[PDB]
Design a protein around this ligand. Structure first.
Ligand SMILES: Cc1cc2nc3c(=O)[nH]c(=O)nc-3n(C[C@H](O)[C@H](O)[C@H](O)COP(=O)(O)OP(=O)(O)OC[C@H]3O[C@@H](n4cnc5c(N)ncnc54)[C@H](O)[C@@H]3O)c2cc1C
Ligand SMILES: *N(O)c1cc(C(=O)N[C@H](C)c2ccccc2)cc(C(F)(F)F)c1
Length: 423
């Protein structure tokens, strides 16, 4: 029933060979786990493999593909609850739930992620500072544990601890079979967006600490990480909120929940265009418009350590490693998941062309991120060390304890668990 497959994350790196079970039958799944528990490198769940790291692979072990288990069981406009299999992806869920006036409460940059993957990495999106991360919206889940049993976890139940260990747990508490999400009510599929441009890193920080952020539910920025100061850190800021029907152009009010470089570019006229183009108010945009080899590196620095955040950006541009695609956002309050990535503060994504001395430069970045109280993201990472990770996540020991109570025999395991000593 299993097939030896060669697996990588989305980074197409650190490949490993595992036995990939793929069945729409939850019974084959439960019994495949029981077949790992009476024997040795254990088992890990895999979703759509959008995670860049090595969390959804398990060298010389069992990897269980969950995408066949993609039944949407029900959606209820009144309770706002959705009840689906872990294999359902968020694009699928988005499209099924619009007709009910329901919005997926946390959307990441690609909708090709499963619900299991969204929970296990506790993903965040453009609205983190107003909605939190994915785990905040899970009202229940069914977790296939090492003992072959299915446990029904809730956020505030008597199983709260294992619930919040599973959130952001990178699949190391067992297999999420099914969950119940509370959605966000919406009257349209549209955003009303305000656009802003900055000329300096200092301007960017100002804009994000002036209180304007509280007027928008969604907010993120494209961010210059190549130009030398004080042009370094200038940003195209896109902020907004879901539009109501009364704010749509009348052509759309009929169907409000529907879904579907020249010579000047670098001169003063180019700079002018880019400011004009990137500055606006109340622009209505659908989801696509408003959301628009390499080493993907993402960290967050606590809010108060702002000067340290600036320092790291300066180190980056002067490093000779150039990143064009840079997403900046200020996270809001965190949640009670010990291994949850987001904390309030300065979040950034950078894309580094694989190049000489880059591996060693990012190790230094790790040191800086750590020294400054921030952390990396497992959904992005494959190269950091156990010691660095354990120091970045001070509640890791708390988490490991929970994980030990629930999988004493190390039935669930992955490349990452072994690398980061989470096993
Ligand atoms: C283009 C792009 C844009 C992205 N943007 C964002 C973003 O804006 N915000 C953000 O937070 N992330 C973002 N990501 C990362 C992505 O959201 C996460 O890596 C997500 O976890 C991937 O989901 P998946 O179903 O592909 O999971 P996989 O990558 O297949 O698995 C990821 C982790 O989830 C676990 N898992 C999967 N299914 C289950 C299950 N059924 N039960 C238990 N554990 C399971 C796996 O074991 C593994 O630990 C982006 C990724 C890409 C490629
Ligand atoms: N990283 O801090 C980060 C990345 C995204 C994101 O959507 N990235 C994908 C790869 C993307 C790259 C280039 C253009 C479009 C999409 C989103 C965030 C967020 F915090 F959600 F805004 C952060």
């Amino acid at each position: 029933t299993t097939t030896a497959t060669r697996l990588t994350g989305w980074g197409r790196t650190a490949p490993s060979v595992a036995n990939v079970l793929r069945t729409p039958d939850a019974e084959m799944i439960v019994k495949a786990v029981a077949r790992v528990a009476e024997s040795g490198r254990g088992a890990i769940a895999r979703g759509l493999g959008r995670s860049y790291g090595d969390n959804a692979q398990n060298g010389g072990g069992l990897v269980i593909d969950m995408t066949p288990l993609n039944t949407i069981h029900s959606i209820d406009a009144d309770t706002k609850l959705v009840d689906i299999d872990a294999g359902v992806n968020l694009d699928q869920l988005m499209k099924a739930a619009l007709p009910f006036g329901l919005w997926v409460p946390v959307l990441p940059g690609t909708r090709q992620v499963t619900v299991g993957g969204a929970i296990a990495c506790d993903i965040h999106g453009k609205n983190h500072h107003s909605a939190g991360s994915f785990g905040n919206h899970v009202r229940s889940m069914d977790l296939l544990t090492a003992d072959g049993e299915i446990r029904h976890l809730t956020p505030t139940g008597e199983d709260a601890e294992l619930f919040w260990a599973t959130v952001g747990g990178n699949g190391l508490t067992g297999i999420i079979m099914r969950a119940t999400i509370e959605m966000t009510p919406t009257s349209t599929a549209y955003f009303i967006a305000d656009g802003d441009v900055t000329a300096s890193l200092d301007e960017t920080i100002a804009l994000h600490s002036d209180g304007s952020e509280a007027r928008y539910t969604y907010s993120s920025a494209w961010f210059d990480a190549i130009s030398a100061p004080p042009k370094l850190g200038r940003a195209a800021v896109s902020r907004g909120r879901l539009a109501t029907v009364e704010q749509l152009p009348a052509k759309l009010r009929s169907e409000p929940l529907k879904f579907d470089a020249n010579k000047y570019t670098f001169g003063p006229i180019g700079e002018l265009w880019y400011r004009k183009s990137g500055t606006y108010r109340g622009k209505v945009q659908n989801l696509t418009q408003f959301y628009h080899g390499f080493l993907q590196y993402q960290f967050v620095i606590p809010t108060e350590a702002v000067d340290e955040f600036k320092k790291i950006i300066g180190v980056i541009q002067a490093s000779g490693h150039y990143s064009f695609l840079n997403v900046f956002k200020l996270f809001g309050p965190r949640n009670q998941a010990p291994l949850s990535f987001p904390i309030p503060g300065w979040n950034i994504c950078v894309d580094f062309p694989i190049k000489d001395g880059l591996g060693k430069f990012v190790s230094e970045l790790d040191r800086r991120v750590l020294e400054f109280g921030g952390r990396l993201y497992t959904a992005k990472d494959s190269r950091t060390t156990a010691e660095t990770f354990h120091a970045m996540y001070p509640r890791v020991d708390e988490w490991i304890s929970v994980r030990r109570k629930v999988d004493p025999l190390r039935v669930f395991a992955s490349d990452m668990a072994r690398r980061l000593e989470l096993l």
